[PDB]
Amino acid sequence: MFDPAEKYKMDHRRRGIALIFNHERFFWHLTLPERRGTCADRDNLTRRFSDLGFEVKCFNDLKAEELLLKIHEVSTVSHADADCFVCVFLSHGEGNHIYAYDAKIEIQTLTGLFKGDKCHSLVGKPKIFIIQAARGNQTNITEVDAASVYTLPAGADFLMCYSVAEGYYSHRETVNGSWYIQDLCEMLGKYGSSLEFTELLTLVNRKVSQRRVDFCKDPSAIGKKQVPCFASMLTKKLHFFPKSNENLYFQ
Amino acid sequence: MFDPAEKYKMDHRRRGIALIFNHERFFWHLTLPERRGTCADRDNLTRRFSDLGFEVKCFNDLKAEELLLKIHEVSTVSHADADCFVCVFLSHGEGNHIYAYDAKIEIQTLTGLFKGDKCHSLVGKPKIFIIQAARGNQTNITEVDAASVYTLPAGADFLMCYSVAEGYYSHRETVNGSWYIQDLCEMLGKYGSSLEFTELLTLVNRKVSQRRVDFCKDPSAIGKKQVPCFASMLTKKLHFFPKSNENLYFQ
Numbered sequence: 001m002f003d004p005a006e007k008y009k010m011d012h013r014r015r016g017i018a019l020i021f022n023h024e025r026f027f028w029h030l031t032l033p034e035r036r037g038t039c040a041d042r043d044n045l046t047r048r049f050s051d052l053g054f055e056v057k058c059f060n061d062l063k064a065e066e067l068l069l070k071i072h073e074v075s076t077v078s079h080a081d082a083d084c085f086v087c088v089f090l091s092h093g094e095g096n097h098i099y100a101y102d103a104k105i106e107i108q109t110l111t112g113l114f115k116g117d118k119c120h121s122l123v124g125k126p127k128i129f130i131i132q133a134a135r136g137n138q139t140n141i142t143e144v145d146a147a148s149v150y151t152l153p154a155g156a157d158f159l160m161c162y163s164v165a166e167g168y169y170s171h172r173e174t175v176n177g178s179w180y181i182q183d184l185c186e187m188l189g190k191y192g193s194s195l196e197f198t199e200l201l202t203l204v205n206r207k208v209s210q211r212r213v214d215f216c217k218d219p220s221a222i223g224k225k226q227v228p229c230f231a232s233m234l235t236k237k238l239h240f241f242p243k244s245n246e247n248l249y250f251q
Numbered sequence: 252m253f254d255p256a257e258k259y260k261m262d263h264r265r266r267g268i269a270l271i272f273n274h275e276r277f278f279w280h281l282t283l284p285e286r287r288g289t290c291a292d293r294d295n296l297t298r299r300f301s302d303l304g305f306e307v308k309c310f311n312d313l314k315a316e317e318l319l320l321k322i323h324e325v326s327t328v329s330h331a332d333a334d335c336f337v338c339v340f341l342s343h344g345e346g347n348h349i350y351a352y353d354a355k356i357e358i359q360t361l362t363g364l365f366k367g368d369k370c371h372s373l374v375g376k377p378k379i380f381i382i383q384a385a386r387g388n389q390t391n392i393t394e395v396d397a398a399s400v401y402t403l404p405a406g407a408d409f410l411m412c413y414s415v416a417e418g419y420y421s422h423r424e425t426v427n428g429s430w431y432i433q434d435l436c437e438m439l440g441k442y443g444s445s446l447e448f449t450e451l452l453t454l455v456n457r458k459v460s461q462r463r464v465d466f467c468k469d470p471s472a473i474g475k476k477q478v479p480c481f482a483s484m485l486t487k488k489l490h491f492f493p494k495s496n497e498n499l500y501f502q
């Protein structure tokens with residue numbers, strides 16, 4: 001009875017929650033530069049995930065304590081009537097660490113809260129982490145950062161999506177926002193509601209990798225290409241088809 | 252002329268090379284156990300990749316010099332008349348290392364040889380690595396290894412495929428071979444010639460993650476689940492549709 005075109009069950013009452021931790025400025029003593037244009041990324045994401053049925057919850061420049069509280073809160077609430085869970089980090093990072101305002105947090109400890117045992121209402125549901133994070137360098141300019149965050153996998157039914165891979169560079173425009181996020185959001189607009197999600201992330205790889213870096217205004221920025229990637233532990237096709245809401249309570 | 256359904260051009264004269272480095276025994280002083288059943292994996296892969304058009308080239312228990320010579324030989328030959336490239340490692344590993352007979356080799360230097368820069372004939376063509384490699388723990392017995400090899404990316408148009416992710420366990424049967432290779436090879440047999448390759452890898456993720464580990468002949472092997480993963484830096488849909496070989500030279 002085995003089906004090679006098996007899809008994730010996406011006919012629950014509500015889509016689910018999409019967390020966005022949005023980090024613009026950092027504690028003085030971390031010496032990490034401003035991320036001017038992250039707020040465009042946050043707004044763009046907030047719109048595209050809204051249009052796909054997500055309850056979007058944005059958080060700006062949380063300290064480590066505040067951030068762990070808010071995520072663990074979400075991890076221990078019930079997602080029984082939800083299709084999936086999405087968690088976005090827009091910040092700096094190093095290795096297996098994302099930066100809150102004041103200190104680094106081990107990514108595995110954030111993903112671990114949503115692993116089958118610890119969050120039962122999400123077992124066998126897709127759990128999607130999108131990570132725009134690289135290393136701080138130390139009107140619309142393009143600022144460029146060296147890939148620093150490891151392209152980590154997680155557990156069954158996770159999809160880890162990374163702006164940039166080892167040996168490549170993450171770009172952010174100070175008004176329009178991150179290359180990766182612009183292209184993710186553009187692909188969500190056009191094909192979010194129809195395409196399989198990894199089919200879509202593959203378009204984002206193309207879009208981003210095709211952005212030319214030969215005739216940059218800054219000479220140093222030349223030849224600093226950006227290739228994103230995703231690490232999939234998904235077990236089925238993932239679609240975000242419009243939800244049948246006609247005469248239904250979805251709040 | 253952006254196309255959401257764009258597929259890698261797979262209409263070259265030949266499919267390409269599939270390298271299989273198969274490692275059963277190791278130099279005494281490494282203190283690594285034999286990998287009984289890796290020869291089933293090597294024969295199963297040889298058959299499935301043959302049946303998809305690949306010129307399959309197997310190498311057994313090469314030392315680091317021999318292995319580097321053979322992979323450098325293949326990387327500087329012309330693949331201009333080829334759709335793609337497949338390289339498989341069946342060995343032990345640690346971090347970003349795979350084990351040859353006598354020493355560990357950095358995986359970045361192997362994947363580095365086929366990067367657009369260094370292997371022009373393969374630029375914009377899929378380069379596919381498959382890695383059955385865990386920590387050597389030390390009739391048909393099921394031996395279980397701890398995940399050890401990093402699920403790292405490898406640059407534009409690379410697909411890195413891993414038997415097991417951080418904090419899960421890799422299984423090998425001494426006669427039937429590795430769970431991951433069995434399930435991969437089953438899905439290649441049935442759907443290799445029709446399905447997009449990442450859809451296929453998603454079926455392998457389901458098949459392996461569903462294998463029960465609750466009533467094992469070893470008590471200590473109980474609860475040691477296996478979740479594979481793949482890191483995709485591909486920019487298009489990858490298909491291995493049968494090639495039209497009627498009155499055509501494909502050698």
Ligand SMILES: Oc1cc(F)ccc1CNc1ncccc1-c1ncccn1
Nearest residue numbers: 150151152398399400401402403416417
């Ligand atoms: O992916 C994994 C698989 C495992 F079995 C165990 C641990 C990890 C996570 N580590 C990494 N993953 C991807 C790229 C680099 C690293 C990396 N690089 C250096 C140090 C630590 N991690």
Ligand SMILES: [Cl-]
Nearest residue numbers: 303304493494
């Ligand atoms: Cl064929």
